[PDB]
Amino acid sequence: ARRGALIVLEGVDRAGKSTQSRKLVEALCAAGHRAELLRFPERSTEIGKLLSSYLQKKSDVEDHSVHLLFSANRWEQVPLIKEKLSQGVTLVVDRYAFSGVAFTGAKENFSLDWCKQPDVGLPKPDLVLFLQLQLADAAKRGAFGHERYENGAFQERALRCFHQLMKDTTLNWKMVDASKRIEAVHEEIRVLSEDAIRTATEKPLGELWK
Amino acid sequence: ARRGALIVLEGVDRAGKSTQSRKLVEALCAAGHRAELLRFPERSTEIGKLLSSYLQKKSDVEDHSVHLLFSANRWEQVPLIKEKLSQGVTLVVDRYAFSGVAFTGAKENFSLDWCKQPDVGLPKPDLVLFLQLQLADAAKRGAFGHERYENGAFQERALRCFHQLMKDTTLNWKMVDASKRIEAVHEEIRVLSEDAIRTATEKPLGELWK
Numbered sequence: 061a062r063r064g065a066l067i068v069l070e071g072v073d074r075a076g077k078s079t080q081s082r083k084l085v086e087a088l089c090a091a092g093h094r095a096e097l098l099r100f101p102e103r104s105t106e107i108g109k110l111l112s113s114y115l116q117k118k119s120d121v122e123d124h125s126v127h128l129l130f131s132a133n134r135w136e137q138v139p140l141i142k143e144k145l146s147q148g149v150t151l152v153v154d155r156y157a158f159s160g161v162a163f164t165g166a167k168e169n170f171s172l173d174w175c176k177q178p179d180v181g182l183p184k185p186d187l188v189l190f191l192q193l194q195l196a197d198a199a200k201r202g203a204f205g206h207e208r209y210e211n212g213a214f215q216e217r218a219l220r221c222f223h224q225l226m227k228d229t230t231l232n233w234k235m236v237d238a239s240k241r242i243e244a245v246h247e248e249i250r251v252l253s254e255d256a257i258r259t260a261t262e263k264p265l266g267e268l269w270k
Numbered sequence: 271a272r273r274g275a276l277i278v279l280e281g282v283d284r285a286g287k288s289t290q291s292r293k294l295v296e297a298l299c300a301a302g303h304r305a306e307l308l309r310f311p312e313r314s315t316e317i318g319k320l321l322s323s324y325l326q327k328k329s330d331v332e333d334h335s336v337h338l339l340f341s342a343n344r345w346e347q348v349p350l351i352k353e354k355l356s357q358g359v360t361l362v363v364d365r366y367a368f369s370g371v372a373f374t375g376a377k378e379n380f381s382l383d384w385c386k387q388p389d390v391g392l393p394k395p396d397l398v399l400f401l402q403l404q405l406a407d408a409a410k411r412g413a414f415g416h417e418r419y420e421n422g423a424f425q426e427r428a429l430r431c432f433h434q435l436m437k438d439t440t441l442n443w444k445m446v447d448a449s450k451r452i453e454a455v456h457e458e459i460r461v462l463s464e465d466a467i468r469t470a471t472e473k474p475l476g477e478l479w480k
């Protein structure tokens with residue numbers, strides 16, 4: 061039975077990860093694929109609620125602790141991720157380990173290596189789309205939110221970490237010009253995703269960063 | 271101001287970590303030291319309650335997730351640990367990262383290296399006492415508990431991991447013959463601890479596994 065593809069959406073702030081993720085799943089399903097949407101953090105579990113309270117500033121969490129919770133929040137979904145992929149279901153994921161590393165990695169005294177370790181071993185995405193957008197363009201999309209990390213300076217330190225992670229040639233990274241309209245960005249992502257489901261899947265699901 | 275020492279108690283099942291830890295703190299205080307007791311897991315925080323529900327079998331948790339929570343449960347106490355040590359308070363800890371690695375490391379497909387990473391960077395113990403006890407002797411102390419991991423076969427796989435961790439010469443490991451009476455074991459630990467508070471402290475607090 062042909063496994064599903066694991067597709068991740070990553071990208072700068074307001075670049076359209078959530079919009080594009082919901083649109084990709086809808087369009088794959090409409091074209092007869094079996095596809096479902098996931099996102100991280102997944103706030104409905106016990107850990108997810110801790111992470112949600114942190115991001116909304118309702119609680120403060122030690123930085124190493126919070127990093128590990130974010131990763132744990134991925135590991136708790138691995139049994140489901142692996143089962144859905146083995147059943148032929150393509151999974152479109154709004155943020156994954158890349159955000160985990162880039163966001164803690166933007167903080168002082170957090171090496172990229174330390175930030176990567178908790179996630180080593182996770183299911184490896186068959187495709188990692190990185191939605192790029194210029195600052196001037198992200199502004200036309202509205203004001204920063206009120207949640208933690210939604211600050212220009214901090215966003216720019218996360219972006220440098222993302223660019224380090226993209227030097228990683230074990231991953232099938234694809235850049236997406238997220239400045240275009242919602243529809244045009246969607247068509248670019250869609251075609252890339254059809255291609256990943258079609259080919260990328262003839263190899264077994266890999267393991268991230270190992 | 272002379273910093274406190276960070277002293278960890280590790281050891282096989284029923285070897286006396288908790289008894290010896292409470293006795294050491296009492297005796298250091300009685301001899302005019304400033305000393306306080308900590309333990310891991312620390313079940314009173316939000317994470318600690320998750321860990322307590324897991325150990326008591328009231329909930330099941332994915333293995334990588336549970337490993338990261340156990341480490342996060344240490345990181346959330348680092349601000350306090352560092353502040354108490356800088357104030358001259360010696361901290362006696364009932365289990366630390368060594369248990370974290372040995373217990374997940376006893377499970378299938380968990381390399382010691384992966385298990386160590388979440389804890390890299392923690393405050394480094396000035397002294398790690400390992401209470402050794404033969405199986406036949408641990409039995410005279412009563413029956414296994416009902417909690418997760420309290421099984422002869424699993425305990426023996428954790429012990430092999432502990433022996434790998436003791437090959438680590440960056441740590442001041444001391445073996446303790448925990449087969450003696452409660453008092454005699456206590457006198458051995460006490461003398462070792464006075465020595466660690468006295469000398470081991472003239473160097474800054476280190477960082478574990480780095």
Ligand SMILES: Nc1ncnc2c1ncn2[C@@H]1O[C@H](COP(=O)(O)OP(=O)(O)O)[C@@H](O)[C@H]1O
Binds near residue numbers: 072076077201238239
């Ligand atoms: N290509 C696009 N062009 C214009 N506006 C967009 C585009 N993609 C998303 N938006 C809008 O920008 C805001 C951010 O989109 P969202 O998908 O929530 O981004 P993210 O999840 O990356 O933060 C929303 O108002 C959304 O409608």
Ligand SMILES: Nc1ncnc2c1ncn2[C@@H]1O[C@H](COP(=O)(O)OP(=O)(O)O)[C@@H](O)[C@H]1O
Binds near residue numbers: 289
């Ligand atoms: N040296 C010792 N000799 C005999 N019994 C002991 C000794 N140390 C502890 N005990 C008993 O063994 C049991 C386990 O002790 P405990 O300190 O809770 O061990 P741990 O925390 O290592 O599991 C308790 O009943 C305790 O009184």
Ligand SMILES: Cc1cn([C@H]2C[C@H](N=[N+]=[N-])[C@@H](COP(=O)(O)O)O2)c(=O)[nH]c1=O
Binds near residue numbers: 100155157
């Ligand atoms: C998945 C993940 C997200 N995050 C962050 C990125 C976002 N903060 N900002 N901007 C935040 C919320 O996600 P959304 O933007 O997808 O709603 O969590 C982490 O810090 N670590 C992680 O492992």
Ligand SMILES: Cc1cn([C@H]2C[C@H](N=[N+]=[N-])[C@@H](COP(=O)(O)O)O2)c(=O)[nH]c1=O
Binds near residue numbers: 325420
């Ligand atoms: C500190 C720590 C303890 N543990 C385990 C060891 C013990 N299980 N058994 N036996 C358990 C409970 O601790 P006590 O024996 O100290 O009450 O948690 C971990 O699995 N990981 C950790 O990081």
Ligand SMILES: [Mg+2]
Binds near residue numbers: 077078079
């Ligand atoms: Mg979003």
Ligand SMILES: [Mg+2]
């Ligand atoms: Mg390494």
Ligand SMILES: [Mg+2]
Binds near residue numbers: 287288289
């Ligand atoms: Mg105990």
